[PDB]
Subunit: 295 residues, 2 copies
Amino acid sequence: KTQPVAVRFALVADGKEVGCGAPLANLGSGRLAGKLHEARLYVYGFELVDAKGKHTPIALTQNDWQYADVALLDFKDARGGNAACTPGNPAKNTTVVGAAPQGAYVGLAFSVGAPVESLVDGKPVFVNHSNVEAAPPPLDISGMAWNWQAGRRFVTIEVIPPAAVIKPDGSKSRTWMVHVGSTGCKGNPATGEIVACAHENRFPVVFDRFDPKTQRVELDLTTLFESSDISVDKGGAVGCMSALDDPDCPAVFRALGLNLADSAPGANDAGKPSRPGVSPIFSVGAAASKVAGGK
Amino acid sequence: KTQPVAVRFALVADGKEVGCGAPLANLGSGRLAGKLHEARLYVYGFELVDAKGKHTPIALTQNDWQYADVALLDFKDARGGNAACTPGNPAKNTTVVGAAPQGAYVGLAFSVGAPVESLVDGKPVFVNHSNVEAAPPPLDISGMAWNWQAGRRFVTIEVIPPAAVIKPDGSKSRTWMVHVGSTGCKGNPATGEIVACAHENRFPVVFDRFDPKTQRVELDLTTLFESSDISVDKGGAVGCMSALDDPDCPAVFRALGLNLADSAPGANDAGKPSRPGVSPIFSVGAAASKVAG
Ligand SMILES: [Ca+2]
Ligand SMILES: [Ca+2]
Ligand SMILES: [Cu+2]
Ligand SMILES: [Cu+2]
């Protein structure tokens, strides 16, 4: 009936595979040498696409890193050292694993973020706005929780530039932070009431041609920070934390493929993809072949 | 010729074994439910003590967590979740492993912190004031470095109160931090100069009776934060980062068993142990237990 699926993800920067303690070269518009502090994101709704364009959902293996249809990617090593990834000291979780019905597939689709709810045994459960203290793994990572109302910062990428970050008032900060999460969220679920968010800030990613056995999904840090001066914060939270009045988020949300505010007056598309299925930071890359070799 | 040696460490709070994502109950002088953000420390100079009182050094296995005679303990889980430690998701590194000459031993002695130098193949290398960008593991962890001149913050324990920490001017930090390292350090080794520190802030820990196969060393977070209102900061860095004029550091250094400043004018003991060999936050407990000693 089923066949195992394994979708590998990779973090890249300046055209090389980074992650763990690897250095980050030529980051931002200033082309600075930065250190990776954190690179975590939730992904969900994984589907394989066949030649006739139909979408077959991947049943995710239920473990500590995957719950219902939601998986948590983390590109840092557990030690927190200054060495690049190795089998002994690897990135914490870079592969989504599961099963799909047997058959031939050609493409891949998935979504970036934490969905509002998901299904377990045909029954729904709150995901994005759940309690980080009560939610099962991997939704119990408070380092990725804002609060229930705001939901999770379901994309947390944090880099450390060589000369820190200068804020408008002049005070210096250590880390340039990219926190992607829902905004305009009204109603507090901690009070037991309903919550709805004006800007969801989730987006799908579609690859018409993707072979999991010889390819991987590459998250490009260079694209992410391309038009951002990571030695400077121009307003709001240091870096970008999804706020519409934050001057630094427009460049980031463009690199994400999301409309920060409305693209046009009355477009009503704030917090939605500007080209669904396409996100400039996500691309297909060659990967070590899982086709078992002889000899 | 030699025998394996494994010294188990455990983090406890409110008389319960904690670590990983176990909650910290009744923490601080306000006795709040806190969460562990980070619990790491360097330890060195491990020795076994026999009944006659002789000291036998333990040769540390060289790996990603132990270099020369220094080991790094890390009580957090790799995931960073809100679950207690389990065999499938355990704390990162809580056992000091090595070998010692075969013999009958009763006690244990070691020291907390990162030493200035240690011998590797009979030759000395700089440890505490090494370059975190260049040193070998486990000295390559920026999360425990200040700079070379200041050395490592060789004790890093960070707790999160239920609401944000409020600084004296009303602004808010998320974590209440304990960063123990040497202070009063002059000279910059980044530029080839000799460094000297007025306050070393390392201390020995001596247990007269410690059986490594049935017992463990317990670091008590309850004692560490007992006289610390972790919901506020009274000045300086948020929490205690060993500054002599930080109003929050006196209570912390008492719990550690260290003199922050001189005990009395002329005493010349600042940065030295208040009672060499005993630290209020360190005790012996049963090795396979859910409860503190
Ligand atoms: Ca900003
Ligand atoms: Ca303070
Ligand atoms: Cu944020
Ligand atoms: Cu500090």
